[PDB]
Amino acid sequence: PEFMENFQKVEKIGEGTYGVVYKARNKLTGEVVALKKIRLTAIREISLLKELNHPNIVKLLDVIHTENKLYLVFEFLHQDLKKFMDASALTGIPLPLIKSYLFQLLQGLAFCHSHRVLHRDLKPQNLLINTEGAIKLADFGLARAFGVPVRTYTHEVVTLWYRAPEILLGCKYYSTAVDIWSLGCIFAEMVTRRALFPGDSEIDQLFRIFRTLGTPDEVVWPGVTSMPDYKPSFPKWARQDFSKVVPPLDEDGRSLLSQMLHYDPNKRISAKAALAHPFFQDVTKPVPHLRL
Numbered sequence: 001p002e003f004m005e006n007f008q009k010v011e012k013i014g015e016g017t018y019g020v021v022y023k024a025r026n027k028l029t030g031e032v033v034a035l036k037k038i039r040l041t042a043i044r045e046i047s048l049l050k051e052l053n054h055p056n057i058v059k060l061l062d063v064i065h066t067e068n069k070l071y072l073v074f075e076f077l078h079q080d081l082k083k084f085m086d087a088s089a090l091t092g093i094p095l096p097l098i099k100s101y102l103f104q105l106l107q108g109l110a111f112c113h114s115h116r117v118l119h120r121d122l123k124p125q126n127l128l129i130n131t132e133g134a135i136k137l138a139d140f141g142l143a144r145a146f147g148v149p150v151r152t153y154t155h156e157v158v159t160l161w162y163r164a165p166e167i168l169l170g171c172k173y174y175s176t177a178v179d180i181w182s183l184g185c186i187f188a189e190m191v192t193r194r195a196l197f198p199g200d201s202e203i204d205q206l207f208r209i210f211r212t213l214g215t216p217d218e219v220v221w222p223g224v225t226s227m228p229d230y231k232p233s234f235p236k237w238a239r240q241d242f243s244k245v246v247p248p249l250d251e252d253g254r255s256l257l258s259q260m261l262h263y264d265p266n267k268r269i270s271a272k273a274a275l276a277h278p279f280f281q282d283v284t285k286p287v288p289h290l291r292l
């Protein structure tokens with residue numbers, strides 16, 4: 001395609017939900033960027049994301065619509081948290097680095113949420129890291145523009161593991177709380193080195209949540225029994241103590257995680273409130289052990 005004459009494709013980074021992603025060099029400026037090519041209201045709203053700038057949001061440099069393709073040109077980062085997690089499987093990511101990452105991601109969310117922008121599909125694969133100790137949120141704003149499909153453009157299953165229960169239960173309106181839920185699940189996975197709720201279908205996802213957190217009821221979540229996909233026949237599981245769910249996380253960490261995984265999105269902690277949590281009293285910005 002013509003647009004691609006502006007860039008040398010250096011390597012394929014991967015397959016995203018919507019399109020293929022390439023590390024590229026701008027043939028003229030020599031700038032190294034990540035190029036997402038999506039095969040085709042969405043243009044207008046994605047274009048508005050160019051102003052949604054923050055140090056913990058992957059910079060959107062350009063939005064180009066040309067020949068039934070949409071190209072999104074981003075800042076390039078060298079690693080994603082999913083691969084970092086897998087690489088850290090023997091040892092675990094050190095707690096101070098987990099804490100720094102969580103603090104940074106909450107800052108990114110606080111920013112986007114203050115501008116009434118949600119992500120809606122946070123997952124380790126779209127959390128990108130650099131050598132300086134930064135982590136940044138990728139694909140912010142794309143799910144609103146395109147939806148979140150069941151399969152990706154290459155037919156891969158879009159993971160349900162981070163999806164908030166209100167979405168699974170069929171709520172029409174997503175609040176910023178969906179992103180806090182996803183981040184809580186990611187926090188837990190960093191700590192324990194296993195996904196918290198690895199569902200392989202919507203019902204399995206919902207049941208895994210319920211097995212850990214208890215089957216939700218009107219006590220904990222007003223209105224849940226009126227949600228579109230709620231069934232009175234759901235099994236009633238008891239809630240498990242977080243001390244079991246995420247050892248060896250400390251009391252402050254378990255408190256915060258619990259608040260990020262409240263069922264009621266109106267009760268779930270906000271990004272701004274999370275930043276103030278005592279868990280972060282001693283937050284630092286360590287440099288991650290990396291090889292590129």
Ligand SMILES: CC[C@H](Nc1nc(NCc2cccnc2)c2ncn(C(C)C)c2n1)[C@@H](C)O
Nearest residue numbers: 014015016034074076077078079080125126138
């Ligand atoms: C494939 C799915 C996407 N991943 C992705 N990874 C990026 N770097 C991590 C990486 C780099 C090289 C090799 N291995 C991983 C990246 N740097 C900017 N971007 C834009 C496009 C956001 C990147 N995107 C996103 C959708 O998760």
